[model samples]
Target: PVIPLDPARRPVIKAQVDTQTSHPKTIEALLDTGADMTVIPIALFSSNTPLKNTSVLGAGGQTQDHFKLTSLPVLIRLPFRTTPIVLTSCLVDTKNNWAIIGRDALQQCQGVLYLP
Candidate 1:
């Protein structure tokens, strides 16, 4: 039996990060594939605690220290199925406040970004 699926009902995959360290944080992120890695806001980490130190190459081709989160688990709720996606967090250089959804998470879901 061939059943037609509704395009409007299609699930939209989006990646978001919590900006606030404690509870009641705002979720905000930008969909980008050019980014080779995922970025987490430094504000999310506690001020007293030492941030995980890791190194990564930036767009300028310079290796810089980035905050690392080992095996960070997140729940992705989809219409077909719900699964937990684990990832490592890194700090990105942004003038404004925002987190980046890089290739790491996109590659995991076999996602293709539609650029307008």
Candidate 2:
């Protein structure tokens, strides 16, 4: 699917997510190849859990980017795509509500990182 990127900055994709019994949240997902799994801000979920096998070594190999995880009913909401895709992955204690759309998530979403 097509995901537009700012020529001057990074490849940022927007996602629309519907949490359990709560209003959906629209957040930014930066396409990151360095990330192993798709990670979302836990603040987005109505209720969250401690996600297993979800973490990133902080920059400088110092602090760790530990993530509390949860799921939500989601749609890709990619404006450039023809249809909405299903994806629901969230983690807390991140940089605000920012999310890192990693390879696994992309693969599950059938994303190709198509850009011009």
Name the 10 consecutive residues with the lowest summed lDDT in model 2.
46-55
Which segments of candidate 2 are over 4 A away from where they belong?
1-7, 47-55, 60-66, 71-76, 80-90, 113-116
Tell me the alpha-carbon RMSD of every candidate. Answer: 7.5, 4.2
How many angstroms is residue 60 displaced in model 2 relative to the true structure, after the best TM-score fit?
4.5
What lDDT score belongs to each candidate, Candidate 1 first?
A: 0.49, 0.60
Q: Residue-wise lDDT of candidate 2 within 1-116, one digit each (tens)?
A: 44456668888778765545356677888888767666666676554333444545656564445654554444445556546555555444445565777776677666675545
- Residue-level lDDT of model 1, residues 1-116, one tens digit each, is 12233555533234434323443233455545677776655555455544445566666566544445433333222224345334545454323434666677667666675445
Clashing residue pairs for model 1: none
Write down the TM-score of every candidate: 0.53, 0.61
Model 2, residue 4: displacement in angstroms?
A: 7.8
